[PDB]
Amino acid sequence: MAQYIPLNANDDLDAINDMLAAIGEPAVLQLDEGNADVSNAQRILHRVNRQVQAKGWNFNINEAAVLTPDVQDNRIRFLPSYLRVMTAGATSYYSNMGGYLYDLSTQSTTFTDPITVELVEMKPFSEMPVVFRDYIVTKASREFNAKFFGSPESELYLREQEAELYQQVMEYEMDTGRYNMMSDIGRD
Amino acid sequence: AQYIPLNANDDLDAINDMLAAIGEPAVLQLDEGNADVSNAQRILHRVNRQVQAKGWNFNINEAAVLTPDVQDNRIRFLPSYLRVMTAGATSYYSNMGGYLYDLSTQSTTFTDPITVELVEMKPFSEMPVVFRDYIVTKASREFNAKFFGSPESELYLREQEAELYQQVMEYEMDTGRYNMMSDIGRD
Amino acid sequence: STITQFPSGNTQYRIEFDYLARTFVVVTLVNSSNPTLNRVLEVGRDYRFLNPTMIEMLVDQSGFDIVRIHRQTGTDLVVDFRNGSVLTASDLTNSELQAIHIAEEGRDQTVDLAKEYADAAGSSAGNAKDSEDEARRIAE
Amino acid sequence: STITQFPSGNTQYRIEFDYLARTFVVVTLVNSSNPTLNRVLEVGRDYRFLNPTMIEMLVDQSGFDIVRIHRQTGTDLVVDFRNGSVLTASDLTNSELQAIHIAEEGRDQTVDLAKEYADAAGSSAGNAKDS
Amino acid sequence: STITQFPSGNTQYRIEFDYLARTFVVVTLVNSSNPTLNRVLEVGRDYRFLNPTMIEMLVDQSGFDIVRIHRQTGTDLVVDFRNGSVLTASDLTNSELQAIHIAEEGRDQTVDLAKEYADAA
């Protein structure tokens, strides 16, 4: 409905049509692949999403996660959907060498028992919270305007928009976790 | 005399006000029109959604019950939800495939009703007046900036927006009292 | 996703699917033990709307266990095209949405009855096939 | 409905449902006692159309007792859109009616077909098992 | 049709039916002996797209023999209409194809699977 929300919306198409708005042109109505603009826009949007999502937040960091090796040999694969691998409360030496998990401390790639680490994975663009989506769209619009069509007045406004959205993301982050500092203290 | 209007609506007037920034006359209906009428609505809707999701004293509902299904125990994630949190503790909630996900237990299988705090969305034509004026000015600034750059239509909207922002502040501060001296008593 | 059930004994309930009109929503009471005493509720005297996504109950829910809400789109057309008029986007949008919705409830209805026969037939066939084949071939 | 049953031994019959093309309607004769035969007729040689609502037989036998007529809509775009042409209301109407008809077609026949397919598989397993 | 079965122990496979979006393709491994051993793969971790018609497997096939591919059409809009834009034939074609596909699959799929199980038995 024109009042409440349009029915059965498509998020990616809306994001693309909003990105072309900064240039000053009307909608596309299909999101096809023959057109030149769509192919250029999609890669930038994907890259910005990947960059922003990999900074670490309170709803991404899975402290307890279990990895297990296979049977034939003793190795663990390194999927392309992994963003950060660290140990909870100590120093860690983990990296990738030939699509396998490497431990610099022992200089080997042969694990024999399941281990526990923390990691951050990727999520589809359409399941992030609203403020993150708006922030990402504004950022991506900035590159798209800067690299393909230089306009002097569409700029100088997206900067204020970006700062205002960044603030709101910050106090959104500070509300999920209470973060008390006087815990673990008590005695007569 | 007076200005008893004819056929007044709270959306057509907003669209007309947005159009007046460039300097074009008013339309009579939204069923047919050129690109501009179809270009303003997107910005207006986006700005409304963005502003409504900041949290106010008349939005936040502390107590609310969500009930699971009966056949397969799960809870859906409607697109009208804006914020999901908890009253006085830390929370881990997110969306995964159109369902409610709890990161702490790494599962999507609830069994009993849960109580949380959430913020829903309302139609444009039922918000208080000051908010509507603020939203209209905010949308008009962007509409002027992106399609027709005029140096006189600007430099005034900013001045108006500052005053509207202030007014929203003192309106918000009066709904609640917020007395710090409460919850204290002793001889 | 167009059929939902909730436990009985409340006063407020939620709607969780899109609809084109307020006459396409059906509410009924369900008795699990004896599915011959079900009753259908009607707007105005039994329940009232509050906002586009939530309703309120007004009758006594005694002797029932489940409350069911589902969508039932009509079959009559909405927009009538005629020669001489002007083409607009809203007509196309509504015409598309009606057909999409109808196909949705059709699939949702049919799959429910199809699955229990399908999987049983498949499992029985596979079990018998492998058992007989390997057993008799090894025996011979 | 979308499925009809008629007793054999009559000269004229009538249809009760709309259609988009005469090829969609399918007519067959069925033996209740013997499910095996249940052969299908053929246009022109065995039946013809005087009136769009009337069906008239040409050949007939006596070993069969019931005749079944049901609708079967195709899965192809009846209307075709090309650049440099005209738009008519009839095309827009028919494009919508197609999927609508398909819906209540499937809604009917799916559950019935599932039955004989399932118990045929079960009977195959059974006779294979005992022999 | 809208469902196909292939023998295991290969590197590439073919997509023959038609689709409107690349997220509408589902791949599943089949265990003939026990249906409960079936598992559903996931894109990017197990397979990738070389061309609009061909995929390649990236996981091993040890206790499986049949690969099954079917179609699952979405529910959101693919074409959106707005005043002041350019309209062509492909838009009107896709707008109807999306509605047709859902009904076609919903009518055919389970019956086709029952056919396959029946004549396999």
Question: What can you tell me about this protein's structure?
Answer:
The structure is cut from a larger assembly and holds 2 copies of chain A and 3 copies of chain C. By secondary structure, chain A is α+β, with helices and mostly antiparallel strands. Chain A has helices at residues 11-21, 36-53, 130-148, 158-176, and strands at 62-67, 82-86, 94-96, 101-103, 115-121. Chain A is built from 4 helices and 5 strands; from the N terminus they run ααβββββαα. Chain A starts with 10 loop residues before the first helix and ends in a 12-residue tail after the last helix. In chain A, helix 1 packs across helix 3 (130-148). In chain A, 11% of the residues are buried. In chain A, the strands form 2 sheets. Chain A has a 3-stranded antiparallel beta sheet with strand order 1-5-2, with no helix packed on it. A two-stranded antiparallel ribbon of chain A has the order 3-4. The longest helix of chain A is centred in the last third of the chain and has 19 residues, at 130-148. Chain C is α+β, with helices and mostly antiparallel strands. Helix content of chain C is 36%, strand content 22%. Chain C has 1 helix and 7 strands, in the order E-E-E-E-E-E-E-H. Chain C has one helix at residues 89-139; strands at residues 3-7, 12-14, 25-30, 39-40, 47-51, 54-57, 66-71. In chain C, the strands form 2 sheets. Chain C has a 4-stranded antiparallel beta sheet, with no helix packed on it. A 3-stranded antiparallel beta sheet of chain C has the order 2-6-5, with no helix packed on it. In chain C, a hairpin with an 8-residue loop joins strand 3 (25-30) and strand 4 (39-40). Chain C is flat and about 75 Å long. Classes of the chains: A alpha+beta (188), C alpha+beta (140). Chains in contact: A-B, A-C, A-E, B-C, B-E, C-D, C-E, D-E. The interface between B and E is small, with 7 and 3 residues. It is classed as viral protein. Keywords: Complex, viral protein. The entry is titled "Structure of the bacteriophage E1004 tail". Chains A, B are Adaptor protein. Organism of A, B: Escherichia phage. Chains C, D, E: Tail spike protein.
